């Protein structure tokens, strides 16, 4: 049950006045593409809240990798879901290292050395990579069941160009004549069910090719992307969600850099 919206003031939407005329806002299966301006952060943060949303952040953070977590914690507490509940869980071998990190009030972090626990905490999953920082609003503009993220390398590419896993003795096999786009295997997200069923799906795939001696080329990111081909994502972030301004520098196209690579 959603309970009413309260008044709110805004700019009026225009029906004959498209959002933007430089991109694609809407998948031919009617998933908003999120760009900056597409989006009255205001209303969206109502209706979340209104919800109590609960948001959790997942980050594997193995051997060398666990320097990066000050930065990205630290970051996240400035761009991340901020005005909602968070619960970052950190998946690490060296506990210990973990860095010390203030948290504003509603956002907690879990660490768990290397479930049906992420079902009972936490109402949406995001799971990103942890060489990396957020320097923009990253927020509940991104929530939906199913979400994958427009590779920053290959938005504009044609799909024959898509660095897709090509061998037919893959489960991760994607013919050149299909495919919609390249998504990143370092940010996707949705609903704890449905990202739950995407991880069991790829994790099954992955048994499979290892079974009968073939890896795909890009691994995790070339099961996902069979997966989103099949299952369609709710919801597909642009590249402002994931960027490298060292490799990329920063487009026309992207008012925003939200969430960027560390040099
Ligand atoms: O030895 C590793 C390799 C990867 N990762 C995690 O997996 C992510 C993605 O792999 P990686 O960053 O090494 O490649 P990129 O995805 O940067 O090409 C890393 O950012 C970490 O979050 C890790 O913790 N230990
Ligand atoms: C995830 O890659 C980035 O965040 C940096 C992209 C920089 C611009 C060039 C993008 C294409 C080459 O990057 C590599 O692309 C392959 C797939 O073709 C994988 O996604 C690699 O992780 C990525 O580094
Ligand atoms: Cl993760
Ligand atoms: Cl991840
Ligand atoms: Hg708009
Ligand atoms: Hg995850
Ligand atoms: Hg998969
Ligand atoms: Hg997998
Ligand atoms: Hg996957
Ligand atoms: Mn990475």
């Given at each position: 049950?959603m309970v009413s919206l309260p008044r709110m003031?805004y700019?009026?939407?225009?029906?004959?006045?498209?959002?933007?005329?430089?991109?694609?806002?809407?998948?031919?299966?009617?998933?908003?593409?999120?760009?900056?301006?597409?989006?009255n952060i205001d209303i969206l943060n109502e209706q979340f809240r209104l919800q109590?949303?609960?948001?959790?952040?997942?980050?594997?953070?193995?051997?060398?990798?666990?320097?990066?977590?000050?930065?990205?914690?630290?970051?996240?507490?400035?761009?991340?879901?901020?005005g909602?509940?968070?619960?970052?869980?950190?998946?690490?071998?060296?506990?210990?290292?973990?860095?010390?990190?203030?948290?504003?009030?509603?956002?907690?972090?879990?660490?768990?050395?290397?479930?049906?626990?992420?079902?009972?905490?936490?109402?949406?999953?995001?799971?990103?990579?942890?060489?990396?920082?957020?320097?923009?609003?990253?927020?509940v503009?991104?929530?939906?069941?199913?979400?994958?993220?427009?590779?920053?390398?290959?938005?504009?590419?044609?799909?024959?160009?898509?660095?897709?896993?090509?061998?037919?003795?893959?489960?991760?096999?994607?013919?050149?004549?299909?495919?919609?786009?390249?998504?990143?295997?370092?940010?996707?997200?949705?609903?704890?069910?449905?990202?739950?069923?995407?991880?069991?799906?790829?994790?099954?795939?992955?048994?499979?090719?290892?079974?009968?001696?073939?890896?795909?080329?890009?691994?995790?990111?070339?099961?996902?992307?069979?997966?989103?081909?099949?299952?369609?994502?709710?919801?597909?972030?642009?590249?402002?969600?994931?960027?490298?301004?060292?490799?990329?520098?920063?487009?026309?196209?992207?008012?925003?850099?939200?969430?960027?690579?560390?040099?």
């Open positions: 049950f003031v700019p009026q939407p225009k029906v004959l006045t498209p959002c933007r005329k430089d991109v694609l806002v809407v998948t031919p299966w009617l998933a908003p593409i999120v760009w900056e301006g597409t989006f109590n949303t609960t948001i959790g952040l997942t980050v594997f953070a193995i051997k060398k990798y666990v320097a990066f977590l000050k930065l990205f914690l630290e970051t996240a507490e400035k761009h991340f879901m901020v909602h509940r968070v619960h970052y869980y950190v998946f690490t071998d060296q506990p210990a290292a973990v860095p010390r990190v203030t948290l504003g009030t509603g956002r907690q972090l879990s660490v768990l050395e290397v479930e049906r626990r992420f079902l009972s905490e936490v109402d949406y999953l995001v799971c990103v990579d942890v060489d990396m920082e957020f320097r923009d609003h990253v927020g503009e991104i929530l939906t069941p199913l979400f994958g993220t427009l590779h920053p390398g290959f938005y504009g590419s044609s799909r024959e160009a898509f660095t897709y896993e090509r061998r037919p003795q893959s489960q991760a096999y994607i013919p050149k004549d299909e495919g919609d786009f390249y998504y990143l295997g370092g940010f996707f997200g949705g609903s704890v069910q449905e990202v739950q069923r995407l991880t069991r799906a790829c994790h099954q795939a992955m048994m499979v090719d290892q079974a009968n001696g073939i890896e795909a080329v890009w691994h995790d990111e070339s099961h996902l992307n069979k997966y989103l081909l099949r299952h369609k994502p709710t919801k597909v972030l642009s590249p402002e969600y994931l960027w490298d301004q060292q490799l990329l520098g920063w487009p026309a196209v992207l008012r925003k850099l939200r969430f960027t690579a560390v040099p």
